[PDB]
Design a protein around this ligand. Structure first.
Ligand code: XMU
Ligand code: ZN
Ligand code: ZN
Length: 232
């Protein structure tokens, strides 16, 4: 009923959308992993009379449900998708997207990691993102590589028309106590990568984490704090 939707409010397999700004939505789905249930976010950005998707809904059936929810709520075609790192909450569902006419993209680093891990593999490589601080335009967004954080390949996404920063899994929600799933993380570089984001996007008005509730710029400092403490 208008609040940001939380894990126990979304059965696994349904998807909900949340309007962030004009022409910007998040998508929220839930999935089981190792016997626990988790929410996850992605982004939808209006691209004229088409849509750009950022990240899958964490699984094939969830991603099919995402496409149906988009058709119901927005009614414009998803033509392109970007996955922001190689984990299944970002790429699981790419094969569904590719069979639904969506052109799928990720950095070469993400594509290599996804292939090696046995995850679904976006079709197209995003060059120009291999060095920390790199940025490229992609439709109505800017893609930014902040350096290693949650993963070595993690990208963040900025929507300049709305000053929306989508941090993906490099950014945690304000209630976070822990750095989340850190198996592929660089805890030592993560704060430096967050500082890069802070420096590059000082006008961000909304910050969206990979999992959990959006907020403002404080999510960036909170993330640095929690990762440093975790490492400690
Ligand atoms: C899909 C992703 N697979 C990996 O990561 C992965 C998988 C396999 C291998 C081994 N080669 C290596 C890594 C993932 C799964 C489950 C939870 C998460 C989380 C996550 C997010 C938030 C929290 C915190 N909540 C815990 C419950 O109580 C409330 C707070 N815990 C975990 C993330 C993430 O942090 O991005 N990713 C996940
Ligand atoms: Zn991840
Ligand atoms: Zn994640």
């Amino acid at each position: 009923s208008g609040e940001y939707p939380t894990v126990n409010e979304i059965p696994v397999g349904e998807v909900r959308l949340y309007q962030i700004a004009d022409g910007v939505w998040s998508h929220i789905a839930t999935q089981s992993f190792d016997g626990a249930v988790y929410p996850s976010n992605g982004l939808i950005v209006r691209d004229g009379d088409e849509l750009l998707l950022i990240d899958t809904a964490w699984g094939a059936k969830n991603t099919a449900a995402l496409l149906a929810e988009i058709e119901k709520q927005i009614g414009l075609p998803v033509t392109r998708a970007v996955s922001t790192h190689f984990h299944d909450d970002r790429v699981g569902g790419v094969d569904v997207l590719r069979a639904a006419g969506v052109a799928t993209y990720a950095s070469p680093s993400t594509r290599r990691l996804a292939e090696a891990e046995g995850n679904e593999i976006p079709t197209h490589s995003l060059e120009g993102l291999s060095s920390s601080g790199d940025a490229v335009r992609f439709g109505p967004v800017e893609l930014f590589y902040p350096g290693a954080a949650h993963s070595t390949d993690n990208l963040v996404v900025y929507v300049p028309s709305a000053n929306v920063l989508y941090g993906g899994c490099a950014v945690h929600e304000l209630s976070s106590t822990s750095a989340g799933n850190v198996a592929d993380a660089d805890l030592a570089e993560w704060p430096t990568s967050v500082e890069r984001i802070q420096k590059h996007y000082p006008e961000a008005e909304v910050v969206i984490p990979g999992h959990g509730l959006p907020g403002g710029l404080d999510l960036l400092q909170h993330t640095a704090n929690v990762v440093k403490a975790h490492k400690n």
